Amino acid sequence: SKSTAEIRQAFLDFFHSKGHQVVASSSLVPHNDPTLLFTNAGMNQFKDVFLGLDKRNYSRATTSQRCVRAGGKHNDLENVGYTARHHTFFEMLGNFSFGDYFKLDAILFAWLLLTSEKWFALPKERLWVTVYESDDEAYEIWEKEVGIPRERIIRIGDNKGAPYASDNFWQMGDTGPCGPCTEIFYDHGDHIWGGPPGSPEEDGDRYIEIWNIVFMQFNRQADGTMEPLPKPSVDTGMGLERIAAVLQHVNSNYDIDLFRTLIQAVAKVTGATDLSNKSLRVIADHIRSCAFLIADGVMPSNENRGYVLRRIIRRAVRHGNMLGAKETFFYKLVGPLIDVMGSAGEDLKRQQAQVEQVLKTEEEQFARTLERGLALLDEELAKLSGDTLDGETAFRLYDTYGFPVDLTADVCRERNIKVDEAGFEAAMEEQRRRAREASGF
Ligand SMILES: Nc1ncnc2c1ncn2[C@@H]1O[C@H](COS(=O)(=O)NC(=O)[C@@H](N)CO)[C@@H](O)[C@H]1O
């Protein structure tokens, strides 16, 4: 089968052959978008084009965009290691129409690449589609233009409990370009638990969302109102790792060539032998987001972007501890990562030594309190009555040992114990008040 690198290139070659300008992935860190934490979609760098504020010399484009979804509007951090399909760092394969073509041709391009004998040649019978309930045009296109049997065309409304809150209405953020969308799912088969989209078991890893095609129509305002974009446009995105799994005849993202190699490297540096332990997958995921974020300029800190990076590094180190890592290990995975990323790792390779030192320093710094804090947590859990760790203890781990609350929650979750988040926040607020009282005016 095709390697991840070959699939990435084949996607771009397809759209290039269809007249799309190949554009380089943007950084994970925007210089000119105050509303955006980290790049979470291929469309981010074209935001102003969709808004009609910027015009390029091309009206259609294609990219393989590095994305991190670990905060802000789209955050999958807590899914990592619990599903076969979610990462913090991933590549989104995208095509874009800036007032060029619209619904029918967007859908045809996608179907052609996926199912043509000349291209990916996926079995059509295993593909399902969803449309926004009110999108009668998208429904008709799939039904009559493409020819998907009606039983595999699913209408989804505002299933997230609010107007425009839907798996089939995509929003860049609380503000920004958005619109109704249609998604393509691949059925991995009955050896995996799960039901089709719209079903009670839709959240399973059996029917995987491969490609989202967004019909950009509005700019969302902070108050929740929708202002029409000047020109209806197209924003699509397919997870490289998810389509690689399909094409490589495996079920999990972590079974593709890229992750198999990377997970072997994690086992090597941690001393783990069981290649099925979920901590190996978590660390493999985390090195991707951490290394690339540092390459794109993020430095560990206790505020904003730096704190998200710090949180992910420390969670990765903690997982290494659970695996029994005896020495500093996380920075050792930068080399192996560069080796599996191909051309998509160019920016990381360029700054290898720098990224390695940042990761090494951060792990060494955390090791000053990691084992001691875990010892305290074990002590508190051993005598804990109930299913919830008190907020005072969570705050003590934070304040004394530098444990972000989500790191503590992650450890506790592995033992079916919850964390009293309201209690943690109450403790933080109490300390804030003490700081105000002491500092004065
Ligand atoms: N956390 C994640 N891990 C791995 N793959 C993901 C993750 N989030 C999204 N994807 C993949 O990226 C595709 C596009 O993401 S999307 O949120 O659904 N859609 C968008 O971002 C829109 N901008 C359309 O491009 C998804 O269909 C899925 O295949």
From Swiss-Prot:
Changing G237A: Greatly decreases affinity for alanine with only small changes in affinity for serine and glycine, in a 2-442 residue construct. Keywords: Acetylation, Aminoacyl-tRNA synthetase, ATP-binding, Cytoplasm, Ligase, Metal-binding, Nucleotide-binding, Protein biosynthesis, RNA-binding, tRNA-binding, Zinc. Binds 1 zinc ion per subunit; it is not clear where this binding occurs. The keyword Cell wall biogenesis/degradation does not apply. Its cofactor is Zn(2+). One of its GO terms (biological process) is alanyl-tRNA aminoacylation. Its EC number is 6.1.1.7, 6.-.-.-. It catalyses: tRNA(Ala) + L-alanine + ATP = L-alanyl-tRNA(Ala) + AMP + diphosphate; (S)-lactate + ATP + H(+) = (S)-lactoyl-AMP + diphosphate; (S)-lactoyl-AMP + L-lysyl-[protein] = N(6)-[(S)-lactoyl]-L-lysyl-[protein] + AMP + 2 H(+). Acetylation at Lys-73 decreases the alanylation activity for tRNA(Ala); a protein that is fully acetylated is inactive in vitro. Changing C181S: No inactivation. Its main location: cytoplasm. GO terms for cellular component: cytosol; membrane. Catalyzes the attachment of L-alanine to tRNA(Ala) in a two-step reaction: L-alanine is first activated by ATP to form Ala-AMP and then transferred to the acceptor end of tRNA(Ala). AlaRS also incorrectly activates the sterically smaller amino acid glycine as well as the sterically larger amino acid L-serine; generates 2-fold more mischarged Gly than Ser. These mischarged amino acids occur because the of inherent physicochemical limitations on discrimination between closely related amino acids (Ala, Gly and Ser) in the charging step. Edits mischarged Ser-tRNA(Ala) and Gly-tRNA(Ala) but not incorrectly charged Ser-tRNA(Thr). Dtd edits Gly-tRNA(Ala) 4-fold better than does AlaRS. Consists of three domains; the N-terminal catalytic domain, the editing domain and the C-terminal C-Ala domain. The editing domain removes incorrectly charged amino acids, while the C-Ala domain, along with tRNA(Ala), serves as a bridge to cooperatively bring together the editing and aminoacylation centers thus stimulating deacylation of misacylated tRNAs. Homotetramer. This is Alanine--tRNA ligase. The lineage of its organism: Bacteria, Pseudomonadati, Pseudomonadota, Gammaproteobacteria, Enterobacterales. The chain holds residues 2 to 442 of 876 of the full protein.
